[PDB]
């Protein structure tokens, strides 16, 4: 899913 | 042959992001201290390799024109480099001088540290094929955001705008190597080559992390979506 990664990418 | 203004701001801009990373010593002094047992090792490493992650993120949001790429690559960008990244900073920092006989004593732990035997001789022929480069801190920092800027990784989409990226990256990066080894016309295509075995540790990194000599193998859950573990 890559949640995590595209949380801290986008923030 | 000399670097230009637009590259001369682009290698500073680089070297900034670069820097605000873990200092080096903090890792090595630890690992130098005292000897840990295969348990201690395993959770130093997660925790490691989840800032790390975190501070990846971080210096490739500042890449110019990453933040305008289709946000899916964004994403396979990332994800298909943070395993040689970390690798490659690895190595960055197992070749930083040491006092006499220390850095015989960071691989002896290293060595010992619960990875199996299976994997270290991989790993340290790699570190030992990146100390013979002697790469300046200005080489590590280009080289990670090469490495960042693969357009060739796997879901890549637009593999286009991903080249358009990389390219200023390898531009800079050709004008040092033909500077600081004008005796080493090949520097250049040395530091490139690297990458290929770099590569090599995706495969099985996996299998290296399940393969460590503790009972239980716990991840964090940035770890796990980056790494497919759990
Ligand atoms: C993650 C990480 C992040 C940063 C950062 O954010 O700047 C820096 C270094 C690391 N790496 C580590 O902590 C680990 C462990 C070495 C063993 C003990 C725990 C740390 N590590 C590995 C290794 C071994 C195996 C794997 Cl699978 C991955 C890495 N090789 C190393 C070579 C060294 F010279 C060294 F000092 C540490 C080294």
Same mark, same amino acid.
């Given at each position: ?11 | ?63 110019? =024109? ?13 994800? =298909? ?49 990146? =100390? ?31 080249? $358009? ?27 490139? =080559? ?23 193998? $716990? ?12």
């Amino acid at each position: 899913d890559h949640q995590l990664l595209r949380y801290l990418l986008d923030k | 042959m000399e670097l230009t203004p637009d590259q001369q701001t682009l290698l500073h801009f680089i070297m900034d992001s670069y820097n605000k990373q873990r200092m080096p010593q903090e890792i090595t002094n630890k690992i130098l201290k005292e000897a840990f047992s295969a348990e201690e090792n395993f959770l130093i490493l997660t925790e490691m390799a989840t800032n790390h992650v975190q501070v990846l993120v971080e210096f490739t949001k500042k890449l110019p =024109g990453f933040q305008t790429l289709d946000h899916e690559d964004q994403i396979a960008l990332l994800k =298909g480099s943070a395993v040689e990244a970390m690798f490659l900073r690895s190595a960055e920092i197992f070749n930083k001088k040491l006092p006499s006989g220390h850095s015989d004593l960071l691989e002896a732990r290293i060595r010992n540290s619960g990875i199996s035997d299976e994997y270290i001789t991989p790993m340290f022929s790699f570190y030992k094929s990146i =100390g013979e480069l002697k790469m300046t801190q200005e080489e590590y920092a280009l080289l990670t955001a090469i490495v960042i800027l693969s357009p060739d990784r796997q879901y890549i989409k637009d593999r286009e705008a991903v080249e $358009k990226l990389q390219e200023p990256l390898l531009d800079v990066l050709q004008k040092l190597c033909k500077i600081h080894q004008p005796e080493n016309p090949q520097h250049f295509a040395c530091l490139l =080559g690297r990458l290929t075995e770099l590569r090599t540790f995706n495969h099985h990194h996996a299998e290296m992390l399940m393969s460590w000599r503790v009972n239980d193998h $716990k991840f964090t859950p940035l770890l796990c979506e980056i790494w497919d573990v759990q």
